[PDB]
Structure formats: structure tokens, C-alpha cells
Design a protein around this ligand. Structure first.
Ligand SMILES: CC(=O)N[C@@H]1[C@@H](O[C@@H]2O[C@@H](C)[C@@H](O)[C@@H](O)[C@@H]2O)[C@H](O[C@@H]2O[C@H](CO)[C@H](O)[C@H](O)[C@H]2O)[C@@H](CO)O[C@H]1O
Ligand SMILES: [Ca+2]
Ligand SMILES: [Ca+2]
Ligand SMILES: [Ca+2]
Ligand SMILES: [Ca+2]
Length: 130
């Protein structure tokens, strides 16, 4: 029920990018597809996503704390509920010389980590099946 290149999970469609881009460019790419950087709302969605992203590349998800440091929300303004940060993260590395890390992404085993938004990562788009 999803366009080619997209994977289905329940009634949603996901795109696991081959493209590598900084956060804002990733956000823009999904918007051009009438989708948004993935919002992970449950352990089941997290697990399904995990199996489609094993590999060395990291994947941007639609979560940031740019508006207010430590206040993580999805792009649609929804406050983070379900969470899967790796222990010790988010650490806002480098805050002493800049804005730190305000963009979230999936790393090993699917855990979340905060990156500087100018880091080049793969990404995941999400949208409704039509
Ligand atoms: C063995 C090692 O240190 N690997 C490096 C990554 O660091 C690990 O993963 C991060 C997410 C933390 O859990 C570290 O404690 C752990 O050692 C390292 O990842 C970067 O770590 C930064 C903190 O030192 C920060 O969290 C950043 O967001 C994260 O990307 C990567 C990239 O520098 O290199 C591995 O070698
Ligand atoms: Ca979702
Ligand atoms: Ca910040
Ligand atoms: Ca931050
Ligand atoms: Ca980090």
C-alpha cells in the first residue's frame, strides 16, 4: 500500500534513506515527499525501525531540543513520550563552544543519541498510507 522504496508498518509508510544530509536538509527532503522525519511513538515502532537500520550509518529522527535545551519535542511540537536514549545520552557534547547537540538520531542497536545538527547522517521519513 506504500509507494515503491517505502516500507509499511501498520497504516504508515517509511523511507529509510540512502541519502546522507545535515538535519535541516533531511527535514526538507521528507517535506518534499509529503512526509516528516520519523516520530517514534512506541516500542513496537522502535523495534520495527531498528531492524531496518542496522549498519554503521546513523539515522536522523524528527526530534530536537533547539527551541529550549533539554526540552525534546517532535517536529510537530509534541513533547517526547516514549524514549530510547542510550545510557548517558543526551549529553549535549560541545555546549561549551557552541549550541551543543540539539538533533536526535538512531545509532547502534537503534538507541538514540543527540548530534550536532550539522552532522551528515542518513534519515527516516514517515507518512500516511493512502
Ligand atoms: C567507544 C567510543 O567512545 N565510541 C565513540 C562514540 O562514543 C560512544 O557513543 C556515544 C553516543 C556515547 O555513548 C559515548 O559515551 C560512547 O563512548 C562517539 O559518539 C559520540 O560521543 C560523544 C560523547 O563523547 C557524543 O555523545 C556524540 O553525540 C556521539 O556521536 C563516536 C563519534 O564521536 O565515535 C566513537 O568512536
Ligand atoms: Ca510514528
Ligand atoms: Ca542547544
Ligand atoms: Ca541539546
Ligand atoms: Ca550525544
Amino acid at each position: 500500500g506504500c509507494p515503491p522504496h517505502w516500507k509499511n508498518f501498520t497504516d504508515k509508510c517509511y523511507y529509510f534513506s540512502l541519502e546522507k544530509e545535515i538535519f535541516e536538509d533531511a527535514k526538507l527532503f521528507c517535506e518534499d515527499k509529503s512526509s516528516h522525519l520519523v516520530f517514534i511513538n512506541s516500542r513496537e515502532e522502535q523495534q520495527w525501525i531498528k531492524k531496518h537500520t542496522v549498519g554503521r550509518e546513523s539515522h536522523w529522527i524528527g526530534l530536537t531540543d533547539s527551541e529550549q535545551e533539554s526540552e525534546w519535542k517532535w517536529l510537530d511540537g509534541s513533547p517526547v513520550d516514549y524514549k530510547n536514549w542510550k545510557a548517558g545520552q543526551p549529553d549535549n557534547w560541545g555546549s561549551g563552544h557552541g549550541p551543543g547537540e540539539d538533533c536526535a538520531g538512531l545509532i547502534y542497536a537503534g538507541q538514540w543519541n543527540d548530534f550536532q545538527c550539522d552532522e551528515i547522517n542518513n534519515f527516516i521519513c514517515e507518512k500516511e498510507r493512502e
